[model samples]
Target chain A: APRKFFVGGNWKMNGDKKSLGELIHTLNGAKLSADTEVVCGAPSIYLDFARQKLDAKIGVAAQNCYKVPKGAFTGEISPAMIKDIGAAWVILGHSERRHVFGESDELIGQKVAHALAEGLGVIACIGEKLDEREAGITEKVVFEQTKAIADNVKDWSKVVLAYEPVWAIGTGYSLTPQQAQEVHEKLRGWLKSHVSDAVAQSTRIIYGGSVTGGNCKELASQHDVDGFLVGGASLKPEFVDIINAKH
Target chain B: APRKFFVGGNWKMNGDKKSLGELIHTLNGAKLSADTEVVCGAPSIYLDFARQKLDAKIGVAAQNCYKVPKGAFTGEISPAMIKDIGAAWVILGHSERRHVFGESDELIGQKVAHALAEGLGVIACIGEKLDEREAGITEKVVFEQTKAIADNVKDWSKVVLAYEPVWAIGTGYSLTPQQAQEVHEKLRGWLKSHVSDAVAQSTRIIYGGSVTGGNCKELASQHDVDGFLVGGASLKPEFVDIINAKH
Candidate 1:
């Protein structure tokens, strides 16, 4: 079977119920592409609410989860908790979690292993910092990060690889569709050489940093870009266009 | 006015909808003492569900929150979202957060400030590690931890100071009532010396670490010990007894 198109909205730490309640309703009414799978990464506080309110066609994901099932890890939601909430996916190793929160490649790998073991699909993220990118070691940093996550993933069927360049994030400087495809293609190559030819062909490699409705179509059109992991624009109605970028 | 007894249940990363739902119903029906203020610190995934299911009289809190109201901090819940869900409190600098998750004193203090500024009550935790305690530096360690948290608070009335000894947690070894009271008394004295006598008099100093229903009464009897931050017991019926310990 062909790798299906996947569109994920990382709401990050934004929005309240009153605001998101309306957004969820809006998304439910929006005509999302059938061929493309849509998942909303809600704040953990709203995972259950988002799951209940959004259409069944639209999936729910936690932005991150702990490396274990459950225990005395205060403030951490586990994959078991995410699964229990009826959410289907978890976005692991997002740049903010790695850079802002200081999560290491090793820890993110453990989290990927645990979340996958708990039967949650993973949008495993990898990227290079601005300095690393400027130094032209983007490939080294990203491949190392990807290797860490890939080593923990037993089943490629349940994972989407999102290449989000840190330099192209928050401040609005972004990768052109060409640049995104360049790195994404290289990632697929990494998977091909390290894992299996089937994995390279089967896995959905997605583009993430500063993805918006306006640029999503071009990015989605890339041969290597299966879909998107939308950021700021995901919260607004603009997300519908991004969700349907494949079609 | 005297400090009211404050019993907080740190559910940590435990419980599920089916289990916690019943527990919430049980808690709602349990006869609690009016003299004690009760709050349940639920996993963020369950915070909204808990607030809606539990009686309004019993407060709901997030186990932790980000240092800001909202942003691109992936996997983090902010105090604004907690407030949006009608949860009134956040537990900051939990031992697991500090030791296992690698959160720093500065980061925890920043979280305390942000949570308080967003109109959520703060349970600021501090403790001496086993080495620090054994080396006779318990006072210095606890005092420094407290200072980090206190320096960030503009309003002490909205905060509960929790002293959770790292050495005594998880393994089930606990502080006897006398040992607990000594530390609690020292914390209040620090508040008096550094902040104000009124602040010391008004703030509730709660003890945490392997707290259970059996020992709750003896711990509650200490004049300086205002309440408990129940851990594993928080998920069970015994939490009711801990809540009513003040009576």
Candidate 2:
């Protein structure tokens, strides 16, 4: 299969069990184009509720997972547990986890290694914050986040890289298509320099952050902006179009 | 009408979805006396799986809840969300939550207040650690735990107080019937002194920590030890006996 198009929406910390219907309804009725693969990441609480409503073509991803399989980590959702719960994919190393939640590079690497070992697909999220980008260290930050996993994970075929700039999330500030393209290109450059060219070429470095239907198609056309990990727009009625951006 | 004898089996952070069936099936085949109310608190991941097989009278509960109704408190369950998904009861202020998870008395009190405001029944867990007990402060600790709720919650009728001494939980070190009785009785006295005699009589002070079928009858015989919030023993077949001990 020629580069299978990938799109994921990370609806972090949003939605209660009672009101998850609005997002589910949008995904179920929207005409997801046949050429693109689509999924959504919801908070752990809504996983079961979302799993039940998600279309066969649409997958549910948990935003976080504990390193160990199970035991004594109160409030942690482990990779083994998430897999058992029918979530085939998980998002790790997101800016929120790294910057906001204090998850270290080593910890994110541990999750990537463990999730992959458990045979689950991963959306490994990596990007720099506003300051990191402004300080001209965006590539260094993204390199550490992505390269950590690319270096540790034995298998890279099933992983999707999501580049979600922390500064843009919920800030109404979006990466210009070229700006996103530049980062995506640089990420692949690092991968190519460090890992196999095949791993570099095949991986999908999707752009996330204030991503909306209005800007998806242009972003998708960038040299390496394979798809998107949408935020607020995913909850809106038009997430389908974002999913169809690659088509 | 007699009180519906409530029994809760808290599995802690134990058991995967697949491993739980044998326990549930054993309970299903064995006779659970008609008058008892049964609920199992399993890892949140297994809540739906347990709900699928549990007999109608027996429902599933979460071990804890997020202080806020719903947001990104990673690894935490929310009372509103669990209630939305049909979990009727939640165990708050368990010894594990207090000692292992860094939950302070004030934090537990806030959760109880929120859970009650959401109109969900709470199995409000209260217990003193081993040091507190050895120091002869079990009554004071349990009193403060209960008092925190009484101080905030306008109504206590829907709450079931679970007295699980910290030294006993999952350590296999159990309290003697007389030992548990003293704490339960003190809880009753505190309720009557602080809240009202009417609320005290209506409330259920269940025993927890190392409760097994072998000793459940004796513990159940204590007038103040109304039911049990069983731990390691709950995962075993003996949970049924603990549930029906009152009968």
Candidate 3:
């Protein structure tokens, strides 16, 4: 089977009702490429609003979700809740959640399981911080984070690996295409070694962090770079250009 | 100026999309009195749905919001954003925010000031945790939290105080009418002493913490207990009785 192109946009904490409406207006009218599967990962607050505007072809994803279905965890949005709201996909273990929110890999793996159990597709994210890279532990951190989820998840077909290096996230930095491709190849190899050959061959290992229209085509040309999870540029019409990069 | 009977439902971390939809359905159809003012405090994810489905006469309050208008603060809802999205009120300085999210009085004060500046009312909450109360610092903790906001907010008319003793929240424990009344009376007295008489009289000091229909009437009858900020009981059909306690 050929690799399917995926483009995801995480609006993060940005966008208001007006801006989101404008984004929807732009997305709805854009000449999107059929080869690219487009999904915008909105903040929990705007997920419902984005859903209302998005067409059947364009999917919606949550920026994050709690592992548990329901509990006393305050000020959290749950994966089950997101699925219940008709969101087909969710992004788990984003850098901010792991660092700022203190989410352990165990917790993220738990969430991945819960989201999958609910039949929601996942764009599972795993990456290392600047410090980890400088300390020469980037691969170790990424490996551990991914291994935690892979150990728990039996089926990899419904999942995508978004390799967002923490150093590149919203800092005007990006991994070289060769560097990203190497990591994706390694991850695919790891999946093949640990899980099954079918799982390894089928999983879409996407790249994230600082993906822009200028750099996307080259990144897409790499053997293992399946797609992108765009951040800041996702809010703009340039997102359309990035989404069409594979073409 | 008479205190408008202020009632707020703190839905806490409970409810999913279906339950929230059901809640709006129940509330929208309920016969709420004109003199009673109600605000439904919801999880951030449900804010838009609440805004769309809620009765126009009633108000919607976010559980909390960030200090910044917008940017880089991932997983945090902004006060200005929520306010701009047609939310009339915001609940700040709640025990959950204070203890769980590590919110300081100074931060709460900033949130209140920003919300007020944006022309949104704030259901500014203040109270003592069980340990603080046991240590005889109930009045001290309450005073500091209230005073911080008052120091920043020159006008308090748009502020309704919700005195939710932390120990009673979702714990099935409640303070007796007399126990709550003393705090309410003391709070009113403190407000009058610190702020102008008109401002003091106009501000609604509502009680919260496991409040239910069975306990509301006697509590409402207390001269200082203007209304309630019901927690778990708020999700029930009995919320109507809590709203009509003044009758």
Per-residue accuracy of model 2 over A1-247 as CA lDDT, tens digit each:
2466788877765667546786687678777788888888877767766787887678888888867786654446677777776788898887766764577888889889999999888998887877887898987888877768876689988899988888887788898888888888888888888988888888888888888878888888877888888877776677878888875
Residues A1-247, candidate 1: write the lDDT tens digits. 5789999999999999889999999998988778999999999889999998988899999999889887888888888888887998999999999988889999999999998888999999999988998898999999999999989989989999998988777778778888888998899999999999999999998888888777788888889999888889888899988988875
Q: Which portions of model 3 miss their true places by more than 4 Å?
A: A71-74, A151-154, A193-196, B14-22, B100-107, B147-154, B186-200
The DockQ leader among the candidates is 1
lDDT accuracy of residue B239 in candidate 3 = 97
Quick one: best TM-score, which candidate?
1
Fnat of the models, one by one?
0.90, 0.28, 0.42
* TM-score, cand. 1 vs. native: 0.97
> DockQ (Cα-based) per candidate?
0.87, 0.26, 0.44
Whichever of 1 and 3 has more lDDT, that candidate is 1
In angstroms, the error of model 3 at B61 is: 1.6
TM-score of each: 0.97, 0.81, 0.89
Error of 2 at A236 (Å): 2.4
**Local accuracy by lDDT, each model:** 0.89, 0.78, 0.84
Off by over 4 Å in 2: A1-4, A12-29, A42-53, A70-78, A93-108, A126-152, A178-186, A189-197, B1-5, B13-22, B46-49, B67-80, B95-107, B126-152, B165-167, B185-198
Better candidate by lDDT, 2 or 3: 3
- Strongest candidate by lDDT: 1
Docking class of 2: acceptable
Superposed by TM-score, candidate 1 places the C-alpha of residue B20 at a distance from the truth, in angstroms, of 0.7
